[PDB]
Design a protein around this nucleic acid. Structure first.
Ligand code: SF4
Lengths: 406, 339
RNA sequence: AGGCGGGC
DNA sequence: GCTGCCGCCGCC
């Protein structure tokens, strides 16, 4: 009877978890929880859906096999979901985090299904008539044309028109496809959007799951009589001078600078100024290379071809509390707010496009860019040092470059 | 208006019954009124949020007693706002973002000529609200100086979440970058709304922009707001030289010079690509000059306060009246004339 | 760029 | 009172 119930509850490889299930409790909850935490970790890192799918695919095979005919793997998926409802129902923040991660897990799994299995799951969204399609044909084609070009690689207009003739449209309230409306990817008429089915199913899933978590919380005090409380508490907590004002502009000295300092000097020469973070990054670097306080004031006054003198002396520990501020290392530089238009602070290995970096660097370039793509900016910078002659401080890059000539 | 003029206005003239019946959505007082936020702005610069009113009589008596220079309408809450110590979808359109394209008025002046910018903005927004969103129950209200407020009162519009309000705004707010020193470079092909809006605005471009406002007769202004709409540097440099050699050509002449110089510059098998691109730049400029330039903040959140219809404008004395197709700012009654 | 104080 | 903006004063 239990097997027949699970055969009926899982006619599809996907479920809305509508009916309650009729060491395993802890392991199955932990294994689902690890997948949900990896999803949330990838979402917080702004990874694309395809990168997230690639990372989670091996974790599914290990921790929570999807698409198996095994009754035990199907049981593990159900019971882990319902066990996590008991864990995450307790606070609004825990419910919102669980609904978000679980709805994203649903999206990934739906995309990993075959088109046949997706259709069966939907059966277990009204198409428009051919007349309504003919009436709206021009407006529907104008809206969808760009999507056919960029998503289906249909570069020729004849091929786009032929595809559009066969293509069906779904009529729904526009409130169900707000994300597609914001991007103008759907046609709008009289409060209806002409399409996105996965977003509708995901919103219904999220709404239903949130309602069921509230119901679960209302019944939870009856369960406080049971073995389970320590595990539920623990799982819920598991979620928780040679160098002078003139020489610093010369090739002899500047050939020793890392890319961030070259970028700051170029911005200063071009704009006759640097904004706050850039002034601090460059001022402290120049202090670190041995530019005296008096020469630094000459440098800045000359470069800016009441408001500034004090700040430059303060960087040298000559004012206020007299703290001799240490020059910034790469970690510190990277921690500052990201540079925008008109800013020159930061790290070019992170902040510049591969196109700009490649032009500056022109097999060696590919090696540097591979490090950049991985977020290993100091490794990319170390590679540039070695190829042009681990460093993680602009002043160490300069000092090492000078040591090679001494 | 003096403080006594405002007392007289609220005593004898302000349509409290009609505003109450509008905001209450029923003939009988309901939670749509009892739980609605009002903010009162006073002549002292004081600003009092979280007022709420139980009846037409309570609403009238509290506004008469308070004598505010204006009040602002907020959301319907789950509890009465006045007990705090224990919304219509709205659009705002002002003239400020059209100041770079008008010559008939300067600074905070308005006339029937530049009011055509607001009239076209209302026409294009109304087309989207009716045809794309299916809204039926909306009204435009004069802001009392040089703008207009839309109030969409459809039940579906009232119940929109801040995410849905943002999506409605992002659909209607085509001109996100208001800077006139740069080409818009709008996405091609145009979305159906934007294509329809262009065809609705095109018939007005010659009569409003090239003839009545004529903003590009001034060669410095043409260099600042007409030339940056073009895509090609050689065309821009050639037009700039040609207008330096031939000063004070009208906006209509300068508009034709663009096509004549482009036809002289772009020859051979690539000419059709340049012709298409120039047409696209001229179309983007029709939209830059005449398309609705909404205030984006007031629309985004359900909690945003907006000035009530029939408020007095404190600097002009104009009543913030409902707008019809015939409306111009000179038709708005002043409180002193009504007295 | 951030924080604190004063004035309009 | 708070909020927000503008100016000044150092600090960090
Ligand atoms: S890795 Fe460090 S030294 Fe190198 S360019 Fe980036 S911030 Fe500068």
């Amino acid at each position: 009877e239990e097997k027949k119930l699970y055969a009926r509850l899982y006619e599809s490889k996907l479920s809305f978890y509508d009916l309650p299930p009729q060491e395993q409790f802890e392991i199955w909850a932990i294994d689902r929880l690890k997948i949900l935490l990896e999803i949330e970790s990838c979402l917080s890192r702004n990874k694309s859906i395809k990168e997230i799918e690639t990372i989670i695919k091996p974790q599914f095979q290990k921790l929570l096999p999807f698409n198996t005919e095994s009754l035990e793997d199907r049981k593990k998926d159900y019971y882990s979901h319902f066990i996590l409802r008991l864990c995450f129902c307790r606070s609004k923040e825990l419910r919102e985090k669980f609904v978000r991660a679980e709805t994203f897990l649903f999206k990934i799994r739906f995309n990993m299904l075959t088109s046949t299995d997706q259709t069966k799951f939907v059966q277990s969204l009204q198409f428009i008539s051919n007349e309504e399609k003919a009436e709206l044909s021009h407006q529907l084609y104008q809206t969808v044309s760009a999507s056919l070009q960029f998503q289906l690689n249909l570069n020729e207009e004849h091929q786009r028109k032929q595809y559009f003739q066969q293509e069906k449209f779904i009529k729904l309230p526009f409130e169900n496809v707000i994300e597609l409306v914001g991007n103008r990817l759907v046609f709008l008429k009289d409060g209806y959007a002409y399409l996105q089915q996965l977003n509708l199913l995901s919103n219904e899933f999220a709404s239903k799951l949130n309602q069921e978590l509230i119901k679960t919380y209302q019944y939870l005090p009856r369960l406080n009589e049971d073995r389970l409380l320590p595990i539920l508490n623990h799982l819920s907590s598991g979620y928780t001078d040679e160098i002078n004002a003139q020489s610093v502009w010369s090739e002899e000295i500047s050939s020793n600078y890392p890319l961030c300092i070259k970028n700051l000097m170029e911005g200063l020469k071009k704009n006759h100024h640097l904004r706050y973070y850039g002034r601090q990054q460059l001022s402290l670097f120049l202090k670190g290379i041995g530019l005296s306080a008096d020469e630094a004031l000459k440098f800045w006054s000359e470069a800016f071809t009441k408001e500034y003198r004090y700040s430059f002396r303060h960087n040298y520990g000559l004012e206020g509390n007299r703290i001799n501020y240490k020059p910034w290392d790469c970690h510190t530089i990277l921690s500052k707010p990201r540079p925008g238009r008109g800013d020159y602070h930061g790290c070019p290995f992170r902040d510049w496009s591969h196109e700009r970096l490649s032009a500056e660097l022109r097999a060696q370039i590919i090696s540097v860019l591979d490090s950049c793509q991985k977020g290993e900016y100091t490794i990319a910078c170390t590679k540039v040092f070695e190829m042009t002659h681990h460093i993680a401080h602009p002043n160490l890059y300069f000092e090492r470059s000078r040591q090679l000539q001494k | 208006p003096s403080s006594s003029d405002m007392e007289y206005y609220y005593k004898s003239l302000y349509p409290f019954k009609h505003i109450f019946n509008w905001l209450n959505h029923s003939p009988k007082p309901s939670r749509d009124m009892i739980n609605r936020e009002f903010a009162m702005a006073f002549r002292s610069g004081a600003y009092k949020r979280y007022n709420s009113f139980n009846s037409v009589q309570d609403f009238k008596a509290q506004i008469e007693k308070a004598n505010p220079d204006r009040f602002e309408i907020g959301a319907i809450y789950n509890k009465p706002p006045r007990e705090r110590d224990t919304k219509e979808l709205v659009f705002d359109i002002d003239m400020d973002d059209y100041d770079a394209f008008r010559t008939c008025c300067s600074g905070a002046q308005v006339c029937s000529k530049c009011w055509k910018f607001i009239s076209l903005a209302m026409k294009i927004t109304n087309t989207a609200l009716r045809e794309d969103f299916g809204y039926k129950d909306f009204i435009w209200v004069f802001s009392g100086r040089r703008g207009a407020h839309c109030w969409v009162s459809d039940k579906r519009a009232r119940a929109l979440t801040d995410v849905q309000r943002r999506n409605v705004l992002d659909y209607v707010n085509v001109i996100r970058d208001r800077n006139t020193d740069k080409r818009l470079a709008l996405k091609r092909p145009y979305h159906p709304h934007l294509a329809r809006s262009l065809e609705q605005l095109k018939p007005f471009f010659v009569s409003i922009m090239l003839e009545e406002q004529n903003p590009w007769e001034d060669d410095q202004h043409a260099i600042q707001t007409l030339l940056p709409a073009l895509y090609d540097k050689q065309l821009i440099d050639s037009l700039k030289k040609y207008w330096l050699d031939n000063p004070r050509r009208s906006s209509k002449e300068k508009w034709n010079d663009i096509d004549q110089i482009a036809t002289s510059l772009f020859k051979g098998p690539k000419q059709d690509s340049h012709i298409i691109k120039l047409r696209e730049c001229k179309e983007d400029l029709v939209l830059m000059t005449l398309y609705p330039k909404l205030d984006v903040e007031v629309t985004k959140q359900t909690i945003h306060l907006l000035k009530a219809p029939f408020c007095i404008h404190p600097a002009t004395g104009n009543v913030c009246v409902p707008i019809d197709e015939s409306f111009a700012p000179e038709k708005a009654p002043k409180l002193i004339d009504l007295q």
